[PDB]
Point group: T
Chain length 64, copies 12
């Protein structure tokens, strides 16, 4: 059985690096992370000093 968690990563550099930021967090706390699916991308402008790229991913991990 796989389970997915819905995470938004952030980066001041790129959409790829924002995806990595989410996956990094998943790997910090979960075993057997197997893949990620991109489900949204965006850019935060008004709330930050530098533009911040965001990539939202479903991160899949194998249970048991």
């Amino acid at each position: 059985v796989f389970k997915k968690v819905l995470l938004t990563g952030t980066s001041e550099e790129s959409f790829t690096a924002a995806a990595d930021d989410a996956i990094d967090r998943a790997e910090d706390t979960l075993d057997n992370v197997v893949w990620a699916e991109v489900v949204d991308q965006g850019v935060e402008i008004g709330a930050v000093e530098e533009r911040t790229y965001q990539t939202e991913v479903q991160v899949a991990f194998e249970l048991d």
Copy 2:
């Protein structure tokens, strides 16, 4: 990093109050709740005494 949980709130009064019911539950158990996105709305009729409005939300919270 943000994470989202997928919650359906209920209310005998309105779709807005059903959204609040979900967000209230998230705030009971999670720190740093930052926003919610409505993803579905519905009305339960046959299983209840009074019509019950339901609003399903992805509730986003900031990790760490």
Copy 3:
């Protein structure tokens, strides 16, 4: 077996009340109405004296 009918309710008050208007009509004419799913919401402006909120629902009822 359930069947659904696709109804747009209207209200001069709210999206919740517009959903109720559709469900009310379904219950006038159908037995065993069990739930409704919201599929669209809108506001009529140019054709009416007062803004009219509209909520379109699939209203499900149990056959037999």
Copy 4:
């Protein structure tokens, strides 16, 4: 010919009132506003003192 503008209204009270807030703004600046279609709903939590309901609408107006 109709044209649409994509507006997000806000309210501390309800999704219906947030839709009205957008339509009000459109009517301040545009002639012949004829209808609105709801395209998204959400709730701002972390950036505000009170929860703020948001309703995004395509507001249609007749040209010429």
Copy 5:
């Protein structure tokens, strides 16, 4: 309030049995599982000895 978890079940037999595999896992660890919605179906071929059917479900459970 209901909450959903996003699970992919697997089976060497059928899409129905793959859905059951996910629901079984949810019932092992959660109380008050109430329904599941199918959100994707697929077949793993290259990574397995026998074709493996997969059915991804949002499994809903009642909180509290």
Copy 6:
């Protein structure tokens, strides 16, 4: 001209048998049923003794 009706079939056995349950009902009451399109699948758990598979179909029939 074709017309479609939106039916949810049920089965304690499989998603295929749930689709058949809907189509069977359509054929009981309608002439010239020509095809069905699957539009949703789900599993009822909390309201039933045995898990019940549900398959929602648009059932198309030829008018006249």
Copy 7:
């Protein structure tokens, strides 16, 4: 309250004429037909002597 019926019109000439074929049928049998929304378009080739254009519409009519 509005209700919609889901009809596929056909024409050997065009997608516009296929939409008209559906609307014509609705007006034969229903009072107060008010609008139609196109939801799919296609072309039947193998089952017919001449290519047949098909346009599927939700035809809305006002109840009461």
Copy 8:
């Protein structure tokens, strides 16, 4: 950079002519119109003397 405006053209003749009606209006007021994407089609019936076909397009134009 391209920008798009969301226009609904109308015609008493066809969906193609309704698309042209929108594009014509864009070309009246904008320089460097480069393409259009159809996003919806419909037919107005109750508000008009003759059926009126409508085609909604995102009309893209090059800035600068």
Copy 9:
């Protein structure tokens, strides 16, 4: 077994004729073409002398 190919037809006349242009090409090179599904429509303006209507279709053909 059916297979589909994803073709964009073009016409200086209409969306229907653009669909035909794609289907014509499929029939030039494939046996047993059975139907087509419209998946997108658009208009090329900047790259052409005359507006060019485009209709993208999945063209289905029976294998073997």
Copy 10:
């Protein structure tokens, strides 16, 4: 690099067996078939002696 082909399998027995029918055909003619994604399901009724289940899949294969 992976490539996908869009195939509709058929079966007089089940949606799972219809998916297998498509994958079987892909494996007859292609090397390195790695997975399939279900994209539609349906039932043919009017054109056949027995109901025929159909499952449409994108079948992915590795190039080179």
Copy 11:
């Protein structure tokens, strides 16, 4: 109230830089730009000397 404009940025380097190109243009002409949502990505090949990455964004700005 927020308003969105629908812009396609371009870059010979990356999808991230194409998003920035759109946002840059918005900030040239608009006050209070607050965020952007990615809605499409593509690559122009035939019309250009070098491949050109394109990222289409809804750029949101606060009115008043």
Copy 12:
């Protein structure tokens, strides 16, 4: 007439480079490649030594 092929490119570096990997393969084997549309993005983790970014594109080419 344009035709599209559905390709998933891969890269250990970025989503942009994964798109290029697919387009490169198309240009190896096809004449008159004209554009690509991004349709999905993902990251392979469990099956590889280094995270592998994947970008799925419809690559369009002009026939004849």
